C-alpha cells in the first residue's frame, strides 16, 4: 500500500522535473548579458531610531511611508515617523516575545504576534487616544512567524506548526486554513493583487496559495536549508527567497521553477529579510554577516553593500514609493537609507 | 530536493558484520555535518553517532562505541556505518541525517519526529536462527 | 524429570497468524496450571497469559488482550498459544512456564530469572522484509 | 556451541535412564507380598510441651533421647526434658525468623539459623550457667534452611541459595563448599557413620555429596515438587524423600533409583516432615493437613494417622531408640508420641 503510493508519487515528481527542464528555453543571465550593469550605489544612513530595549524583530512600512512599526522583544510596540523621528504610539505588548508585526494598509489596525501563539490587534481609531487590544486571535499551537493585512477585516497568518490561517477580525475564528508544509512556515508576502500569497516554510520549499479557494497552486523545491525570508516582485508574477545556506534565488510562478541564483563565495552566513525595490531591478537582502547587501535581480552583481548594524539585521522594509529603505537589527537601533546623489 | 537514501540492512546473525549505505543528493555533501538516527521497535529516536565535515571529529554512543565505524566520502557523496559485533538488542530501523544548517558544530532537532532532512531508513534486525 | 519442550516460531510478517506448541512431560498436565512467559531483547521477563487445571479460567496481559488465544489439552498434554495481529513489538522469546504447586490459584515466581519449571523456550521475530 | 553441549547432555540422561531401566530386576512391593502387614498402629500423646509464643518451625532430639530443643518464630530456642516436661534451657535468639535448629550429638552446643542467614551456634558448658553465643557463621547469601552436627567441631548446613556449606567452628570458615543445586535446599539428612549426606532442594532433586571430597555422587530426580523433607533409612543404605506433590519416595543408593513411592488418592496436600523409626519399617511423615501418617515401609500402607495438632506439622522427629516420636506445628505445641499395648 505505501510502496505503491510512494513510487507513483516518485514518478509524478519525475515528470514534473521533466516537464520544469522542457519548459527551460535560456537562461536569464544568459539573455541580460546585452543590458548596461547597475553599477555602484552608495546609501547614507539618513535617519536612527533608538529606544527600544531588547533586540528588534520585525517591522512593517506604511501605506503612505510615513508611519513604520516596530516590535522589540521587551515587549514594546513602538509606532515611528520617519520623516521627524518623533514616536507616535509606545504600545506595551502582553507578551514580551514578539516575532512579527504588521501595519494594516488603512493605518487603523496594528497587528503582533510571537511565542505565545496569539495574533494581538490593536485599534488607532479610539477617540479617548489609549491604544487597547481590539481583538486577539488564539488558533495556532506552534509559535507566531508572521502575519499580512489584507483588508480592515481579513488577515493572513503564519505560524511554526506549518499552517498557515486566514482569520476574520469581526468574528474571531480561522476563515481559511493552509496545510501542505513539512515545516515550520517563517514568512510570507501579500500579491499586489491581494489575490495570491506564497509562503516560505524550513522544509527548503515554498508554496503559492490562493486566498479564496485555500488550495496550494505551485510548489517551487530549490534552497538546500531553511527559508527564512520571502517577498514578491513589484509585478507580482515572481518572488525572491533568502534561506541560511547564503543564497537567495529568485522564483517565476508561470515558469515554475527558479530563474536565478545569488550566491558569494566570500558569503557564507544566513539570510534574515530580503525585499525588492520599486522598479524590482535591486534586490536589498539582509544577511546574518552584521550587514545587509543590495543585489542586481537581473545580473547577480553586488551592486552595494549597508554596514551600519552593530549585530544581524533582523528585519528589512522598503517604502511603497522607494524613498527609503529602513532596516531593524538587534542592536535596538533602526537606520533609514536612501540614496544620494 | 534534499533526498537522502538508505542501503543495506536485513537480517544478520548476532556477532556478524554488516554496512549500511547513505547516498544524498540534493545539496552539498561536503558542507554539511551528517548524524545517523536509530530507532527500536516501541522505543522513540536515539542518536547514534556523527562525524564533522571533513572527519577529522567522530563521536559515538556507550551502546555502540568500539562496535561502529562511521565514514563519509565527499568525492562519492556517501555515508557508511560499517556494524560488527552486534547483539539482538541492536535491532532497529536506521536514519541517516544532515544537521539543518551549514558550517555549524550544533544539531539541535536531528532526533525528532518530524525532522525533514532525513532519509527513509532501513531495517535491520540481530535475530539468531 | 519434568521438562517442557516449546515449538513453533521463527520469522513471521506483521499482521500474520503464528502457533505456539508446549509439550511437557514427567509430570501430570491436568493438575498443573499452565503459565506463558516472554522477554523482549534486553529487557526482562513479563507474563503473558495463564489458563487455569480445566481452562474454565483465563486470563491475558494488556498487550496481548484480543490478540492472542491460550488453550490447553489435558489428553495429548500439550499446551497452546495461538497468536495473530502481530507487531513489531511483539518480538520476544517465549517460555512455557508451570505453576510451581499443585491444586493450586496462585504462582510466585514463574516470572523468576533462575525458575526451574519453565522449558528452554523458542525465538519470535516479528520483522518485515 | 551450546547445541553440541546439550544434545550430549541429552544423550548421558538418555544413558542414565537405560542403565537404571537394566538393572530394574523387580518392583519392592512385588517381593514384599509375602509379607505380614504392620497393622493398625495406635499412638497416645503422652507429654504436651506448651510455652513458646510463636510457631514452631523445627526440632531436634538428644542423643540420650532425653532433652529436645525447639525453635519458634518468636526468637525463642527452649531445650525440654521430655520425661518430666520441666525446660532445662530458654535461648532469647537475636533474630526472630528462625528456620532450622540442631542438636550436637555431645550436647555441649546447639546451632541454630533461619532469614538472617547467620548460623548462630551457643554453647552450654559454661559454668556461670549463662548461655551465650559460642561462634557466628556468615557466608552463606541465601536463606538458611538446615543444620546439622558432624561433631564438635564441623557442621554441616544448608542454605537457600543452592549451596551447602561444610564450616570449622574453631576457624569459623567453610571448608568445602557444595555447588551442585539449580534451586533452594530445604533439608539434609546424615549418615550414620557421617561420610556421606543427602541433599533435597526446590528443583525435584536429590543429590548425594561426600564430605571429603566435596563432590556430587548421585542424583535422583523421581519428584514432581518441591522437596520439603528427607531423611537416610536407619542402615544407611537408602533414604525417604517427601515433596509437595502429596507423595513420599523411597530412593536406593546401590540401585540409584527409586524403589516405592507412598502416595494416597484422598491426600492432596504438602509434606513438612519425614522420618524413619528404629528399625526402619514405619516411615512418619508429617503432612500439611493439620496432621501426621505413618506409612509402611514395605507395603505402602498406612499403618496409623496422628491428629493432635491445630496446624500443619512443621517438624517430626524420632528418638535414637525409638520409644517416642515428637511432632511440632504451627499452634506452638509439641506432642510427643508413644505407642501402647
Known amino acids: 500500500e505505501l510502496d505503491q503510493l510512494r513510487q507513483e508519487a516518485e514518478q509524478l515528481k519525475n515528470q514534473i522535473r521533466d516537464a520544469r527542464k522542457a519548459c527551460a528555453d535560456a537562461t536569464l543571465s544568459q539573455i541580460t548579458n546585452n543590458i548596461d550593469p547597475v553599477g555602484r550605489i552608495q546609501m547614507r544612513t539618513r535617519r536612527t531610531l533608538r529606544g527600544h530595549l531588547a533586540k528588534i524583530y520585525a517591522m512593517h512600512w506604511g501605506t503612505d511611508s510615513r508611519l513604520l512599526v516596530s516590535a522589540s522583544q521587551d515587549g514594546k510596540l513602538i509606532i515611528w515617523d520617519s520623516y521627524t523621528t518623533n514616536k507616535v504610539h509606545a504600545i506595551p505588548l502582553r507578551s514580551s516575545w514578539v516575532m512579527t508585526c504588521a501595519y494594516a494598509p488603512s493605518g487603523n489596525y496594528v497587528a503582533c504576534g510571537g511565542l505565545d501563539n496569539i495574533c494581538s490587534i490593536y485599534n488607532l481609531k479610539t477617540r479617548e487616544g489609549n491604544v487597547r487590544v481590539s481583538r486577539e486571535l488564539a488558533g495556532h499551537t506552534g509559535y507566531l512567524s508572521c502575519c499580512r493585512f489584507l483588508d480592515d477585516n481579513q488577515i493572513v497568518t503564519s505560524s511554526g506548526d506549518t499552517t498557515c490561517a486566514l482569520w476574520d477580525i469581526e468574528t474571531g475564528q480561522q476563515t481559511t486554513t493552509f496545510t501542505g508544509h513539512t515545516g515550520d512556515v517563517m514568512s510570507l508576502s501579500l500579491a499586489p493583487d491581494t489575490r495570491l500569497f506564497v509562503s516560505g516554510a524550513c522544509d527548503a520549499s515554498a508554496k503559492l496559495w490562493d486566498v479564496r479557494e485555500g488550495m496550494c497552486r505551485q510548489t517551487f523545491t530549490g534552497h538546500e536549508s531553511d527559508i527564512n525570508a520571502i517577498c514578491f516582485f513589484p509585478n507580482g508574477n515572481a518572488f525572491a527567497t533568502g534561506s541560511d545556506d547564503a543564497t537567495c534565488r529568485l522564483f517565476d510562478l508561470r515558469a515554475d521553477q527558479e530563474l536565478m541564483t545569488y550566491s558569494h563565495d566570500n558569503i557564507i552566513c544566513g539570510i534574515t529579510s530580503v525585499s525588492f525595490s520599486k522598479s524590482g531591478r535591486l534586490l536589498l537582502a539582509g544577511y546574518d554577516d552584521f550587514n545587509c547587501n543590495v543585489w542586481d535581480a537581473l545580473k547577480a552583481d553586488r551592486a552595494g553593500v549597508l554596514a551600519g548594524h552593530d549585530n544581524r539585521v533582523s528585519c528589512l522594509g522598503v517604502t511603497d514609493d522607494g524613498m527609503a529603505v529602513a532596516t531593524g537589527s538587534w542592536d535596538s537601533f533602526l537606520k533609514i537609507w536612501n540614496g544620494s546623489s | 530536493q534534499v533526498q537522502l537514501q538508505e542501503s543495506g540492512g536485513g537480517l544478520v546473525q548476532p556477532g556478524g558484520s554488516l554496512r549500511l549505505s547513505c547516498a544524498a543528493s540534493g545539496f552539498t555533501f561536503s558542507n554539511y555535518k551528517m548524524n545517523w538516527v536509530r530507532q527500536a521497535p516501541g522505543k522513540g529516536l536515539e542518536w547514534?553517532?556523527?562525524?564533522?565535515?571533513?572527519?577529522?571529529?567522530?563521536?559515538?554512543?556507550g551502546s555502540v562505541k568500539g562496535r561502529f565505524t562511521i565514514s563519509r566520502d565527499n568525492a562519492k557523496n556517501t555515508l557508511y556505518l560499517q556494524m560488527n559485533s552486534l547483539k539482538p538488542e541492536d535491532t532497529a530501523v536506521?536514519?541517516?541525517?544532515?544537521?539543518?544548517?551549514?558550517?555549524?558544530?550544533?544539531?539541535?532537532?536531528?532526533?525528532?519526529?518530524?525532522?525533514?532532512?532525513?532519509?527513509?531508513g532501513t531495517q535491520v534486525t540481530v535475530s539468531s536462527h | 524429570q519434568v521438562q517442557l519442550q516449546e515449538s513453533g516460531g521463527g520469522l513471521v510478517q506483521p499482521g500474520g497468524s503464528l502457533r505456539l506448541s508446549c509439550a511437557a512431560s514427567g509430570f501430570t498436565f491436568s493438575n498443573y496450571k499452565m503459565n506463558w512467559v516472554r522477554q523482549a531483547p534486553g529487557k526482562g521477563l513479563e507474563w503473558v497469559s495463564d489458563?487455569?487445571?480445566?481452562?474454565?479460567?483465563?486470563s491475558y496481559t494488556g498487550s496481548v488482550k484480543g490478540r492472542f488465544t491460550i488453550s490447553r489439552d489435558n489428553a495429548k498434554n500439550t499446551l497452546y498459544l495461538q497468536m495473530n495481529s502481530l507487531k513489531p513489538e511483539d518480538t520476544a522469546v517465549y517460555y512455557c512456564?508451570?505453576?510451581?504447586?499443585?491444586?493450586?490459584?496462585?504462582?510466585?515466581?514463574?516470572?523468576?530469572?533462575?525458575?526451574?519449571?519453565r522449558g528452554q523456550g523458542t525465538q519470535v521475530t516479528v520483522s518485515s522484509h | 556451541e551450546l547445541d553440541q553441549l546439550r544434545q550430549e547432555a541429552e544423550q548421558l540422561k538418555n544413558q542414565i535412564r537405560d542403565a537404571r531401566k537394566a538393572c530394574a530386576d523387580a518392583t519392592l512391593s512385588q517381593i514384599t507380598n509375602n509379607i505380614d502387614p504392620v497393622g493398625r498402629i495406635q499412638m497416645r500423646t503422652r507429654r504436651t510441651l506448651r510455652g513458646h509464643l510463636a510457631k514452631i518451625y523445627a526440632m531436634h532430639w538428644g542423643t540420650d533421647s532425653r532433652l529436645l530443643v525447639s525453635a519458634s518464630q518468636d526468637g525463642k530456642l527452649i531445650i525440654w526434658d521430655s520425661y518430666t516436661t520441666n525446660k532445662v534451657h530458654a535461648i532469647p535468639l537475636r533474630s526472630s525468623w528462625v528456620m532450622t535448629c540442631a542438636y550436637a550429638p555431645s550436647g555441649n552446643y546447639v546451632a541454630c539459623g533461619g532469614l538472617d542467614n547467620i548460623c548462630s551456634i551457643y554453647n552450654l558448658k559454661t559454668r556461670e550457667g549463662n548461655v551465650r553465643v559460642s561462634r557466628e557463621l556468615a557466608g552463606h547469601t541465601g536463606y538458611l534452611s538446615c543444620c546439622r552436627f558432624l561433631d564438635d567441631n564441623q557442621i554441616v548446613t544448608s542454605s537457600g541459595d543452592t549451596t551447602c556449606a561444610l564450616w570449622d567452628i574453631e576457624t569459623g570458615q567453610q571448608t568445602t563448599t557444595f555447588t551442585g543445586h539449580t534451586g533452594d535446599v530445604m533439608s539434609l539428612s546424615l549418615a550414620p557413620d557421617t561420610r556421606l549426606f543427602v541433599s533435597g532442594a526446590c528443583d525435584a532433586s536429590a543429590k548425594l555429596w561426600d564430605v571429603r571430597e566435596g563432590m556430587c555422587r548421585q542424583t535422583f530426580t523421581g519428584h514432581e515438587s518441591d522437596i520439603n523433607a528427607i531423611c537416610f533409612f536407619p542402615n544407611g543404605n537408602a533414604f525417604a524423600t517427601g515433596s509437595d506433590d502429596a507423595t513420599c519416595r523411597l530412593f536406593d543408593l546401590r540401585a540409584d533409583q527409586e524403589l516405592m513411592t507412598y502416595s494416597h488418592d484422598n491426600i492432596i496436600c504438602g509434606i513438612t516432615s519425614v522420618s524413619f523409626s528404629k528399625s526402619g519399617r514405619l516411615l512418619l511423615a508429617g503432612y500439611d493437613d493439620f496432621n501426621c501418617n505413618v506409612w509402611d515401609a514395605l507395603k505402602a500402607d498406612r499403618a496409623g494417622v496422628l491428629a493432635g495438632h491445630d496446624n500443619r506439622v512443621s517438624c517430626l522427629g524420632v528418638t535414637d531408640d525409638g520409644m517416642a516420636v515428637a511432632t511440632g506445628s504451627w499452634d506452638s505445641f509439641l506432642k510427643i508420641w508413644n505407642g501402647s499395648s
Open positions: 489458563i487455569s487445571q480445566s481452562g474454565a479460567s483465563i
Open positions: 512456564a508451570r505453576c510451581p504447586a499443585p491444586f493450586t490459584r496462585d504462582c510466585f515466581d514463574v516470572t523468576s530469572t533462575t525458575y526451574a519449571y
